[PDB]
Amino acid sequence: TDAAITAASDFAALEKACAGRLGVTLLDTASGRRIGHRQDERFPMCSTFKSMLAATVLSQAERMPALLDRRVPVGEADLLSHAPVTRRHAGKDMTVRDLCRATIITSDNTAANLLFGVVGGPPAVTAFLRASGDTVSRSDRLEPELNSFAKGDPRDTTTPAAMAATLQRVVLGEVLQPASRQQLADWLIDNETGDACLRAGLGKRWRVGDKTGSNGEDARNDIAVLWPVAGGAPWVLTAYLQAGAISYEQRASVLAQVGRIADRLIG
Amino acid sequence: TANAPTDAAITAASDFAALEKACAGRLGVTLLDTASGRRIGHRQDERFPMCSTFKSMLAATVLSQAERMPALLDRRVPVGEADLLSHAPVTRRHAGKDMTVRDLCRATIITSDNTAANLLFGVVGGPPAVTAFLRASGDTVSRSDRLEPELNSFAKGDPRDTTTPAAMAATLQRVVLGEVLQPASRQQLADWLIDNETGDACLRAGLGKRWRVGDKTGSNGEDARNDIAVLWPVAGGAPWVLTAYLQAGAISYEQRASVLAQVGRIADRLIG
């Protein structure tokens, strides 16, 4: 129940309260120390992969800067469910840069597929991940098929620990040039879809950038970079959950509770 | 001339003059057919406060300068706690760090963000740079004079930060649809207008599905509520421009939006 979610003082109790499978990594970027729960098990990325699709675009634009201003057409036939920004531009076109922003802050699925076309598909995103040092996460399909998950099928999956290390390297490290990583961070900070997830459980001391993901079966995820507003080293927090026995809304509550527990662990 | 305006009298009005009488206000409208140049309207040459509608031209000014220094759009500007104003829905998230000029442009068009507008004035040379851009584009009427939030103040006979419906309609045509900016600039500006999030209850509420609409609103805490828009026919054809400026202090803030929605309904009937 809702009461059991709210009473949970550690990740195992939280997982038991929703009868699900929860994967979490909390990473202190100053020390490299991590606090995890099932952090090496695979979970479907769902829309959390869009953060790295955008990063792949920025990385390609470092060698061809006009790429971000290139315009790609949006057709009525390309519209998928949940395409809030691209739907306004059907019959005309959008810049690659505005497609990146849209796919991160509203999770627009049509934007994502158009950007896959621009960067060279799931192999391009996988190549960027490997190049960045991540040998675990992988992109294999487009929207909306990538949201499918089956135990033992590693397509479009990551682990909480791998994704936390990758967020650190790509958003905070040297994989991208400073201008590119700052643009990516700003999009994560402007995210609109995560207000009921990790952000709901985190206190005012953090500036948060995050990207959510979900599918229609049982998965609800949120990955985040937390910058201390007062200054200091950021933390990274990834949270992946599969819990088919509770409602969509209750899955957000579980993620909010992850944020509350994490905030206590950092102190 | 209404002694006690109601929602019902507003939605019953079928022409601009009757709509003005129903809300006991002062309404300025210009509906411009870009293919023939003809205009239909009301008080088209009287001055009204721009309020936030000027941001469309602040963004156009930035783009015009960036055509000559392209790195300008990627320059990052710090957002300080001290820069934050009451309406800062996007810049509040970035206080203590910085934002690109391009993202500040986006924020000031599609939200109520006033801090973004002041940071951008710092980059371009202030209100005088916006006025100079307007003059070079052929507008001899519109003028930018003050920073936020003072520019939203209006007094009869004080022309600071004002325009007229006819002047702004012509300027929107030249800037959004014409050759004042380079194609890539004008398309970026159109896309920001199309993405606007503050105007759902204003002109858009009165306009039918046959139009793709970009718009920019503006209002103050006294009696002004405005919305300027470019209407592209989804099926294809020539766009129309519609500017609407309202002062109506006898009705509530929410009812001022209803008056603009009714302008939209009337206009849609007039275009046929």
XYZ file of C-alpha atoms in Angstrom:
539
model
C 0.000 0.000 0.000
C 0.764 3.673 -0.020
C 1.500 3.509 3.708
C 4.085 0.769 3.324
C 5.883 2.745 0.521
C 6.048 5.849 2.709
C 7.291 3.895 5.781
C 10.159 2.165 3.981
C 13.522 3.168 5.437
C 15.766 1.316 3.010
C 15.674 0.127 -0.573
C 14.849 -3.472 0.231
C 11.884 -2.498 2.349
C 10.742 -0.223 -0.485
C 11.016 -2.993 -3.003
C 9.043 -5.302 -0.691
C 6.297 -2.676 -0.204
C 5.492 -2.566 -3.918
C 6.205 -6.271 -4.505
C 8.491 -5.243 -7.355
C 12.081 -5.256 -8.504
C 14.014 -2.042 -7.825
C 17.500 -1.116 -9.022
C 19.309 1.906 -7.598
C 22.752 3.461 -7.636
C 23.630 6.585 -5.636
C 27.061 7.787 -6.684
C 29.203 10.421 -4.999
C 31.222 11.954 -7.775
C 33.812 13.402 -5.396
C 34.859 9.997 -4.012
C 33.642 7.437 -6.503
C 31.859 5.583 -3.685
C 28.464 4.108 -4.518
C 25.553 2.951 -2.535
C 23.472 0.441 -4.597
C 20.606 -2.043 -4.605
C 20.599 -4.651 -7.432
C 22.902 -2.203 -9.172
C 24.352 -4.784 -11.493
C 21.029 -6.302 -12.694
C 19.619 -5.321 -16.128
C 16.487 -3.233 -16.435
C 14.888 -1.791 -19.600
C 16.016 1.733 -20.208
C 12.716 2.924 -21.734
C 12.949 6.671 -22.322
C 16.019 7.114 -20.083
C 18.019 6.211 -23.234
C 16.992 9.600 -24.741
C 19.620 11.323 -22.596
C 22.297 9.376 -24.459
C 20.624 9.769 -27.848
C 20.899 13.508 -27.300
C 24.538 13.100 -26.206
C 25.259 11.138 -29.371
C 23.899 14.026 -31.441
C 26.008 16.564 -29.544
C 29.132 14.415 -29.963
C 28.585 14.241 -33.753
C 27.945 17.976 -33.843
C 31.356 18.628 -32.322
C 32.876 17.515 -35.632
C 30.121 19.120 -37.780
C 28.597 22.049 -35.834
C 26.082 22.922 -38.544
C 24.362 19.586 -37.639
C 22.458 21.228 -34.759
C 20.883 23.772 -37.086
C 19.949 21.249 -39.771
C 16.162 20.935 -40.193
C 14.354 17.606 -40.412
C 10.765 17.280 -41.611
C 7.995 16.135 -39.348
C 5.141 14.401 -41.043
C 1.666 13.567 -39.768
C 2.432 9.900 -40.474
C 5.473 10.009 -38.233
C 3.463 11.037 -35.168
C 3.399 8.506 -32.385
C 1.531 8.514 -29.166
C 3.193 11.036 -26.865
C 4.698 13.467 -29.320
C 3.670 16.720 -27.659
C 6.169 19.033 -29.348
C 6.545 17.488 -32.773
C 2.716 17.300 -33.162
C 2.688 21.165 -33.376
C 5.115 21.093 -36.237
C 3.608 18.361 -38.410
C 3.764 19.322 -42.076
C 6.795 21.519 -41.464
C 10.265 20.914 -39.991
C 12.322 21.459 -36.836
C 16.011 21.913 -36.105
C 18.000 18.965 -34.767
C 18.773 21.044 -31.645
C 15.018 21.633 -30.933
C 14.308 17.913 -31.545
C 16.983 17.116 -28.872
C 15.397 19.493 -26.396
C 11.923 18.096 -27.100
C 12.919 14.478 -26.638
C 14.507 15.183 -23.311
C 12.154 17.593 -21.612
C 8.817 16.130 -22.849
C 10.068 12.628 -23.781
C 8.637 13.241 -27.310
C 8.811 9.874 -29.098
C 8.585 11.140 -32.682
C 11.516 13.488 -32.001
C 13.512 10.538 -30.826
C 12.890 8.501 -34.000
C 13.792 11.394 -36.249
C 17.037 11.873 -34.326
C 17.831 8.160 -34.653
C 17.638 8.714 -38.411
C 20.017 11.647 -38.216
C 22.718 9.995 -36.056
C 22.853 6.479 -37.539
C 20.331 4.548 -35.472
C 20.745 2.257 -32.421
C 24.269 1.147 -33.533
C 25.429 4.829 -33.458
C 24.106 5.299 -29.939
C 25.657 2.004 -28.873
C 28.973 3.028 -30.474
C 28.910 6.304 -28.543
C 28.233 4.419 -25.285
C 31.098 2.006 -25.917
C 33.358 4.874 -26.842
C 32.482 6.584 -23.585
C 33.524 3.526 -21.562
C 30.143 1.856 -21.028
C 30.303 -1.821 -22.047
C 26.886 -2.661 -20.567
C 24.203 -0.284 -21.817
C 22.981 -0.936 -25.348
C 20.497 0.554 -27.810
C 18.955 -1.844 -30.325
C 15.467 -0.685 -31.356
C 13.463 2.489 -32.074
C 10.260 3.816 -30.474
C 8.084 2.327 -29.397
C 9.452 -1.216 -29.659
C 12.484 -0.430 -27.482
C 10.213 -0.259 -24.457
C 9.561 -4.029 -24.562
C 11.383 -6.090 -22.016
C 11.822 -9.784 -21.341
C 13.986 -11.441 -18.786
C 17.154 -12.629 -20.419
C 16.774 -10.388 -23.545
C 19.344 -7.605 -23.041
C 18.108 -5.365 -25.897
C 17.703 -1.717 -24.890
C 18.783 -2.375 -21.271
C 21.284 -0.938 -18.841
C 22.123 -1.524 -15.147
C 21.731 1.137 -12.495
C 25.464 1.140 -11.902
C 26.457 1.362 -15.557
C 24.013 4.199 -16.263
C 25.180 6.126 -13.144
C 28.843 5.920 -14.295
C 27.856 6.925 -17.802
C 25.860 9.929 -16.583
C 28.878 11.007 -14.588
C 31.259 10.695 -17.544
C 28.961 12.290 -20.141
C 27.192 15.018 -18.165
C 29.989 15.877 -15.728
C 33.166 14.477 -17.307
C 35.227 14.863 -20.441
C 33.451 12.705 -23.024
C 31.898 15.851 -24.523
C 33.411 19.360 -24.921
C 32.323 21.773 -22.196
C 29.782 23.605 -24.325
C 28.114 20.352 -25.308
C 27.940 18.870 -21.849
C 26.545 22.131 -20.474
C 23.801 22.200 -23.096
C 22.892 18.594 -22.177
C 22.821 19.415 -18.448
C 20.565 22.404 -19.100
C 18.032 20.253 -20.960
C 18.036 17.742 -18.029
C 17.518 20.637 -15.597
C 14.535 21.809 -17.663
C 12.824 18.437 -17.706
C 9.051 18.624 -17.417
C 8.064 14.969 -16.899
C 9.587 14.099 -13.581
C 7.831 16.193 -10.981
C 6.177 13.218 -9.229
C 9.324 11.003 -9.351
C 12.773 11.573 -7.791
C 12.220 15.345 -7.576
C 9.190 14.850 -5.328
C 11.433 13.259 -2.687
C 14.479 15.507 -2.898
C 14.924 18.639 -0.811
C 15.523 22.252 -1.855
C 19.254 21.954 -1.396
C 19.554 20.279 -4.819
C 19.363 21.602 -8.397
C 18.149 18.451 -10.186
C 18.463 17.395 -13.868
C 16.629 14.170 -14.699
C 15.168 12.002 -17.459
C 12.235 9.634 -16.826
C 11.264 6.451 -18.674
C 8.278 4.100 -18.524
C 6.496 1.477 -20.516
C 2.870 0.316 -20.524
C 3.523 -2.889 -18.631
C 5.332 -2.329 -15.370
C 8.362 -0.161 -15.689
C 9.001 3.326 -14.391
C 12.472 4.815 -14.197
C 14.177 8.127 -13.457
C 17.915 9.002 -13.713
C 19.253 12.240 -12.200
C 22.196 14.475 -11.542
C 21.953 16.425 -8.300
C 24.011 19.589 -8.015
C 24.193 21.185 -4.525
C 22.943 24.745 -4.874
C 25.401 25.861 -2.193
C 28.321 24.472 -4.150
C 30.218 21.215 -3.900
C 30.415 17.944 -5.746
C 27.359 16.563 -7.534
C 25.838 13.201 -6.879
C 24.271 10.906 -9.496
C 21.203 8.835 -8.716
C 19.681 6.227 -11.016
C 16.470 4.403 -10.234
C 14.839 1.646 -12.274
C 11.659 -0.095 -11.157
C 9.453 -2.869 -12.403
C 6.256 -3.245 -10.347
C 3.217 -4.540 -12.195
C 1.124 -4.988 -9.057
C 0.832 -1.295 -8.289
C -0.616 1.509 -10.454
C 1.330 3.883 -12.752
C 0.805 6.600 -10.195
C 2.025 4.446 -7.328
C 5.198 3.696 -9.311
C 5.992 7.430 -9.229
C 5.474 7.250 -5.432
C 8.084 4.559 -5.162
C 10.538 6.698 -7.075
C 9.767 9.692 -4.866
C 10.564 7.453 -1.894
C 13.890 6.517 -3.452
C 14.647 10.248 -3.542
C 13.715 10.634 0.149
C 15.897 7.726 1.210
C 18.763 9.013 -0.944
C 18.533 12.498 0.494
C 18.954 10.990 4.020
C 21.965 8.908 2.912
C 23.806 11.905 1.630
C 23.197 14.081 4.651
C -21.704 50.859 -23.325
C -21.913 48.174 -20.619
C -22.446 49.262 -17.047
C -21.897 45.709 -15.745
C -20.058 43.507 -18.258
C -20.709 39.792 -18.150
C -19.209 36.752 -19.784
C -22.419 36.385 -21.731
C -22.365 39.828 -23.289
C -18.729 39.218 -24.327
C -19.377 35.921 -26.117
C -22.440 37.357 -27.821
C -20.549 40.207 -29.484
C -20.252 39.659 -33.185
C -18.035 42.560 -34.348
C -15.069 44.374 -32.779
C -16.934 47.489 -31.962
C -19.696 45.613 -30.150
C -17.054 43.549 -28.281
C -15.401 46.710 -27.100
C -18.737 48.083 -25.829
C -19.509 44.810 -24.050
C -16.408 44.888 -21.917
C -16.482 48.652 -21.486
C -12.835 48.698 -22.636
C -10.599 49.992 -25.477
C -9.803 47.345 -28.060
C -7.292 47.632 -30.894
C -7.171 44.952 -33.556
C -5.574 44.503 -36.955
C -6.325 41.455 -39.147
C -3.898 41.438 -42.081
C -4.143 39.327 -45.225
C -0.525 38.899 -46.307
C -1.446 38.007 -49.893
C -3.380 41.190 -50.760
C -2.206 43.504 -48.028
C -5.727 44.396 -46.931
C -6.490 45.053 -43.289
C -9.684 44.900 -41.299
C -9.633 46.238 -37.693
C -10.545 48.613 -34.930
C -8.595 51.537 -33.458
C -5.724 50.301 -35.657
C -3.670 53.483 -35.290
C -4.050 54.136 -31.549
C -1.228 53.418 -29.170
C -1.359 50.561 -26.668
C 1.290 49.284 -24.210
C 3.202 46.348 -25.705
C 3.802 44.607 -22.391
C 5.376 41.217 -23.212
C 4.420 41.319 -26.874
C 7.654 43.357 -27.368
C 9.653 40.170 -26.576
C 8.962 38.912 -30.095
C 11.035 41.861 -31.355
C 13.659 41.524 -28.629
C 14.233 37.953 -29.874
C 14.240 39.161 -33.521
C 16.871 41.760 -32.501
C 19.059 39.065 -30.986
C 18.771 36.960 -34.121
C 19.613 39.925 -36.333
C 22.826 40.576 -34.322
C 23.749 36.877 -34.308
C 23.650 36.810 -38.114
C 26.787 38.892 -37.839
C 28.273 37.112 -34.817
C 26.891 33.583 -34.878
C 28.655 32.486 -31.715
C 26.413 35.024 -29.956
C 23.555 32.479 -29.743
C 25.839 30.064 -27.883
C 27.271 32.612 -25.498
C 26.382 31.788 -21.931
C 25.059 34.505 -19.604
C 25.040 34.112 -15.817
C 21.747 34.123 -14.048
C 22.116 35.682 -10.618
C 19.775 35.503 -7.619
C 19.708 39.278 -7.980
C 18.399 39.100 -11.568
C 15.354 37.074 -10.602
C 12.019 38.786 -10.989
C 8.496 37.668 -9.991
C 7.826 35.921 -13.275
C 10.912 33.780 -13.956
C 9.579 30.237 -14.578
C 12.616 29.054 -16.546
C 15.500 31.225 -15.267
C 14.639 30.376 -11.627
C 15.907 26.838 -12.286
C 19.288 28.187 -13.411
C 20.011 30.773 -10.713
C 23.623 30.424 -9.706
C 24.756 29.074 -13.119
C 24.312 30.282 -16.672
C 22.177 29.784 -19.851
C 22.826 30.242 -23.573
C 21.482 33.328 -25.290
C 19.460 31.002 -27.582
C 17.780 29.294 -24.671
C 17.071 32.670 -23.032
C 15.408 33.670 -26.332
C 13.240 30.558 -26.260
C 12.273 31.131 -22.605
C 11.200 34.704 -23.082
C 8.961 33.902 -26.031
C 7.227 30.776 -24.770
C 6.811 31.550 -21.051
C 6.156 34.603 -18.889
C 9.884 34.849 -18.151
C 10.867 38.492 -17.502
C 14.376 37.769 -16.097
C 15.321 36.209 -19.424
C 14.254 39.413 -21.227
C 16.422 41.616 -18.998
C 19.482 39.361 -19.485
C 18.961 39.554 -23.223
C 18.660 43.370 -23.118
C 22.189 43.266 -21.554
C 23.521 41.317 -24.505
C 22.037 43.425 -27.319
C 22.590 47.035 -26.082
C 19.274 47.577 -24.245
C 15.923 49.008 -25.388
C 17.687 51.306 -27.842
C 19.021 48.301 -29.779
C 15.472 46.962 -30.132
C 14.169 50.330 -31.284
C 17.033 50.692 -33.784
C 16.271 47.262 -35.177
C 12.602 48.238 -35.545
C 13.477 51.460 -37.413
C 15.786 49.659 -39.796
C 13.032 47.175 -40.460
C 10.671 50.019 -41.466
C 8.595 50.467 -38.277
C 8.428 54.120 -37.296
C 5.854 53.642 -34.556
C 6.811 50.853 -32.167
C 9.361 51.667 -29.493
C 11.190 49.959 -26.670
C 12.316 52.241 -23.863
C 12.449 50.503 -20.523
C 13.610 47.280 -18.815
C 11.467 44.726 -17.021
C 9.290 45.134 -15.188
C 8.801 48.839 -15.631
C 8.121 48.671 -19.367
C 4.731 47.115 -18.601
C 3.453 50.420 -17.146
C 1.237 52.580 -19.286
C -0.180 56.134 -19.073
C -2.284 57.970 -21.631
C 0.015 60.234 -23.609
C 3.239 58.511 -22.528
C 4.420 56.621 -25.657
C 7.191 54.582 -23.983
C 7.026 50.842 -24.817
C 3.994 51.216 -27.045
C 2.934 50.214 -30.506
C -0.277 50.293 -32.516
C -2.146 47.302 -33.844
C -1.456 48.212 -37.463
C 2.257 48.865 -36.904
C 2.874 45.630 -35.035
C 0.918 43.645 -37.616
C 3.084 45.032 -40.434
C 6.262 44.424 -38.428
C 5.264 40.859 -37.660
C 4.685 40.327 -41.366
C 8.110 41.748 -42.330
C 10.022 40.012 -39.579
C 8.334 36.668 -39.257
C 7.357 36.166 -42.891
C 9.474 38.602 -44.889
C 13.077 39.344 -45.609
C 14.279 41.372 -42.613
C 16.023 38.276 -41.187
C 17.827 35.435 -43.004
C 15.691 32.309 -43.604
C 17.262 30.248 -40.854
C 16.666 33.116 -38.339
C 13.122 33.760 -39.305
C 12.233 30.071 -39.167
C 13.737 29.759 -35.655
C 11.647 32.714 -34.551
C 8.471 31.266 -36.105
C 9.124 27.974 -34.325
C 9.377 29.708 -30.958
C 6.043 31.506 -31.600
C 4.410 28.194 -32.587
C 5.695 26.675 -29.341
C 4.211 29.356 -27.105
C 2.715 28.099 -23.822
C 1.066 31.218 -22.389
C -1.676 31.757 -24.974
C -4.098 28.888 -24.770
C -6.964 30.979 -23.433
C -6.456 33.932 -25.737
C -6.570 34.074 -29.552
C -5.940 30.351 -29.911
C -9.118 29.556 -27.908
C -11.182 31.312 -30.565
C -9.375 30.058 -33.675
C -10.286 26.870 -35.507
C -8.162 23.762 -36.260
C -7.495 24.934 -39.808
C -4.774 27.252 -38.479
C -1.275 26.558 -37.228
C -0.808 29.456 -34.783
C 2.327 31.153 -33.456
C 1.651 33.905 -30.942
C 3.063 36.095 -28.174
C 0.981 37.419 -25.288
C 1.469 40.371 -23.012
C -0.322 41.685 -19.949
C 0.128 43.829 -16.867
C -1.430 44.038 -13.366
C -3.536 47.062 -14.334
C -5.822 46.567 -17.300
C -3.857 45.431 -20.341
C -4.056 42.034 -22.002
C -2.659 41.508 -25.503
C -1.904 38.745 -27.988
C -0.253 38.968 -31.432
C -0.289 36.054 -33.811
C 0.680 34.647 -37.175
C -1.840 32.219 -38.586
C -0.606 29.664 -41.134
C -3.264 27.634 -42.941
C -2.609 23.979 -42.325
C -3.908 23.107 -45.819
C -1.538 25.609 -47.430
C -1.828 29.150 -48.685
C -1.038 32.643 -47.512
C -0.756 33.391 -43.776
C -2.718 36.029 -41.943
C -1.492 38.283 -39.127
C -3.742 39.215 -36.228
C -2.807 41.666 -33.525
C -5.041 42.346 -30.544
C -4.456 44.923 -27.817
C -6.975 45.402 -25.001
C -7.339 47.727 -22.013
C -10.357 46.706 -19.896
C -10.089 47.462 -16.230
C -13.764 46.941 -15.403
C -13.586 43.185 -16.056
C -11.332 40.596 -14.405
C -7.993 39.393 -15.702
C -9.562 36.100 -16.765
C -12.385 37.863 -18.590
C -9.755 39.915 -20.535
C -8.624 36.594 -22.033
C -12.235 35.782 -22.995
C -12.348 39.050 -24.900
C -9.230 38.024 -26.846
C -10.702 34.565 -27.549
C -13.779 36.324 -28.963
C -11.490 38.443 -31.188
C -10.207 35.109 -32.504
C -13.745 33.831 -33.229
C -14.700 37.017 -35.047
C -11.513 36.973 -37.092
C -11.997 33.376 -38.087
C -15.516 34.274 -39.361
C -14.118 37.271 -41.287
C -11.398 35.278 -43.065
C -14.111 32.911 -44.318
